[PDB]
Design a protein around this motif. Structure first.
Motif, PDB file in Angstrom:
ATOM      1  N   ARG A  55       0.244  12.736   2.350  1.00  0.00           N
ATOM      2  CA  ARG A  55       0.582  13.412   1.088  1.00  0.00           C
ATOM      3  C   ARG A  55       1.093  14.841   1.288  1.00  0.00           C
ATOM      4  NH1 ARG A  55       0.238   8.990   0.106  1.00  0.00           N
ATOM      5  NH2 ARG A  55       2.472   9.487  -0.095  1.00  0.00           N
ATOM      6  N   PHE A  92       3.275   2.109   2.506  1.00  0.00           N
ATOM      7  CA  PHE A  92       3.782   2.549   3.813  1.00  0.00           C
ATOM      8  C   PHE A  92       5.260   2.206   3.938  1.00  0.00           C
ATOM      9  CE2 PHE A  92      -0.779   2.392   4.539  1.00  0.00           C
ATOM     10  CZ  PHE A  92      -1.010   3.554   5.261  1.00  0.00           C
ATOM     11  N   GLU A  97       0.814  -1.215   0.000  1.00  0.00           N
ATOM     12  CA  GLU A  97       0.000   0.000   0.000  1.00  0.00           C
ATOM     13  C   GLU A  97       0.853   1.274   0.000  1.00  0.00           C
ATOM     14  OE1 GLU A  97      -3.737  -0.329   0.130  1.00  0.00           O
ATOM     15  OE2 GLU A  97      -2.922  -2.271  -0.520  1.00  0.00           O
ATOM     16  N   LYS A 102      -3.366   6.947   3.946  1.00  0.00           N
ATOM     17  CA  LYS A 102      -2.536   7.189   2.769  1.00  0.00           C
ATOM     18  C   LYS A 102      -2.729   8.607   2.259  1.00  0.00           C
ATOM     19  CE  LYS A 102      -2.261   4.372  -0.695  1.00  0.00           C
ATOM     20  NZ  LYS A 102      -2.163   3.243  -1.644  1.00  0.00           N
ATOM     21  N   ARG A 103      -3.988   9.036   2.211  1.00  0.00           N
ATOM     22  CA  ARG A 103      -4.357  10.353   1.704  1.00  0.00           C
ATOM     23  C   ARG A 103      -3.750  11.472   2.553  1.00  0.00           C
ATOM     24  NH1 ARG A 103      -9.163  12.813   2.769  1.00  0.00           N
ATOM     25  NH2 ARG A 103     -10.112  10.774   3.221  1.00  0.00           N
ATOM     26  N   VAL A 141      -6.767   2.190   5.580  1.00  0.00           N
ATOM     27  CA  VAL A 141      -5.507   2.414   4.858  1.00  0.00           C
ATOM     28  C   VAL A 141      -5.626   3.589   3.868  1.00  0.00           C
ATOM     29  CG1 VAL A 141      -4.089   1.513   2.984  1.00  0.00           C
ATOM     30  CG2 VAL A 141      -4.310   0.202   5.088  1.00  0.00           C
ATOM     31  N   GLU A 142      -6.768   3.656   3.179  1.00  0.00           N
ATOM     32  CA  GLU A 142      -7.052   4.684   2.178  1.00  0.00           C
ATOM     33  C   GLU A 142      -6.970   6.077   2.779  1.00  0.00           C
ATOM     34  OE1 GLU A 142      -8.693   1.711   2.241  1.00  0.00           O
ATOM     35  OE2 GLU A 142      -8.541   1.007   0.159  1.00  0.00           O
TER      36      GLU A 142
END
Length: 241
Positions: free
Chosen positions: A241, A44, A42, A237-238, A233-234
């Motif tokens: 950034r 990380f 993913e 992740k966002r 996770v989504e």
């Protein structure tokens, strides 16, 4: 900013202890190696793994899991009962270069240098209860203030800390970022915030603090909400950034 998923291990298993009490341990049925593999897929690049068997009991029961995880040691910061240079060396031989240390540094602050000398990047785990330093061994009364402790330890080469608000670990309360920002700015250390990183609002405040501190607040560690799927996770992740 960094967004760091956290995994605690106990008796070979992904686990969580309620209020840190071993009699109140929740075990998860996810395979820790599979879990770490997925996180790396993913994208990380930093995962926080704590060996609770070693931390609480000096048990070597999670060593087979740590050896299996060592394939990915590059993307792991490992903590839990790293109380000797020999232990730290043991982990490092597996490939764990980034290690979280606590009581060891408080008993023997020259260990910071000794760790760097075995190519370990030592990360001090500062724990606070209601803004105050939580540590049960010998500690100058002036250093109950986290900034006063970190000031001293910097003279031993401390560069980076985890700051954990212990009363918020495992809850869905909100990490006090005013406290974290002050530590990061005044002590002039790099900081990963832990405890009560439990909503999308936490991540918003973190990103805002990451900006105000010029990257001194490096990011956050997500435990409960990550393991429970509250912060996906989504979503994590966002915000990295």
């Amino acid at each position: 900013m960094l967004v760091v998923p956290a995994i605690d291990l106990f008796r070979g298993k992904v686990a969580r202890m309620i209020k840190g009490r071993k009699e109140n341990t929740i075990f998860y049925e996810k395979d820790p190696v599979e879990l770490v593999e997925k996180l790396i897929e993913e994208g990380f690049t930093l995962i926080h793994v704590v060996d609770l068997s070693n931390a609480i009991e000096n048990s070597g029961e999670n060593l087979p899991v740590l050896e299996k995880l060592s394939e990915f040691a590059e993307y792991i910061q490992i903590g839990g009962g790293i109380r000797s240079l020999d232990y730290a060396e043991k982990l490092r031989k597996l490939g764990y270069r980034r290690q979280i240390v606590s009581s060891k540094v408080l008993e023997d602050p020259s260990s910071l240098k000794s760790l760097r000398e075995i190519d370990v990047e030592p990360v001090f785990s500062l724990v606070t209860r209601g803004g105050r330093v939580a540590f049960k061994g010998w500690l100058a009364e002036e250093e109950i203030d986290p900034v006063s402790l970190l000031k001293r330890l910097k003279e031993y080469g401390l560069e980076e800390i985890v700051h954990t608000e212990i009363e918020k670990v495992g809850t869905l309360q909100e990490h006090d970022f005013s406290l974290t920002k002050k530590i990061a700015i005044e002590a002039e250390v790099k900081v990963l915030a832990a405890g009560g990183i439990s909503s999308e609002n936490s991540l918003k405040t973190a990103q805002k603090v990451h900006t105000e501190t010029n990257g001194l607040l490096k990011g956050v560690i997500v435990g409960r909400a990550f393991l429970e799927g509250i912060l996906t996770v989504e979503v994590m992740k966002r915000y990295a950034r």
